[PDB]
Design a protein around this nucleic acid. Structure first.
Ligand SMILES: [Zn+2]
Ligand SMILES: [Zn+2]
Ligand SMILES: [Zn+2]
Ligand SMILES: [Zn+2]
Lengths: 79, 74
DNA sequence: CCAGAACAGGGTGTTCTG
DNA sequence: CCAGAACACCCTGTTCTG
């Protein structure tokens, strides 16, 4: 009830439909509004926690998608 | 030969005793002075090529070390 | 030609405003 | 509360100077 589902830092609200911190929120929005042609250097399961979230934007974006994050979630909730 | 021995980008000279590119050179200096204790997010065997050298400072640093980089190139 | 400094770009993170 | 914007910092990479 308190921590980000993407990196396990302290959540700051339900953003794009999921509990996340502010840094995961803006990271997702940026990935979604632009390009997200990232490449993993490991095996697409990089551990995304508070520090290492910087290491692999590929895995970080994957873990946002897998958690259900989507921009329209707030509008959709109102329906 | 003229590719960087850490990330395989085009090398720019012999830096800290190893053929490397500029970004790796300064990455390595920054790593040593910073004492950041990088931690890998995978299995300590990340691929470090040009397109991915930013992804893992722990592995990039380790790879600098294994390549023989050292701040006193006599 | 190379180390370190200075300057620059890219990527990430926090506070503000609707 | 939570959206996007504006402001801010961190991390990486290139050109300058000793
Ligand atoms: Zn997060
Ligand atoms: Zn990854
Ligand atoms: Zn390199
Ligand atoms: Zn690694």
């Amino acid at each position: 009830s308190h921590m980000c589902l993407v990196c396990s830092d302290e959540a700051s609200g339900c953003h794009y439909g999921v509990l996340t911190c502010g840094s995961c929120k803006v990271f997702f929005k940026r990935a979604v509004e632009g390009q997200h042609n990232y490449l993993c250097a490991g095996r697409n399961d990089c551990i995304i926690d508070k520090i290492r979230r910087k290491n692999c934007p590929a895995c970080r974006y994957r873990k946002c998608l897998q958690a259900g994050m989507n921009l329209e979630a707030r509008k959709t909730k109102k329906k």
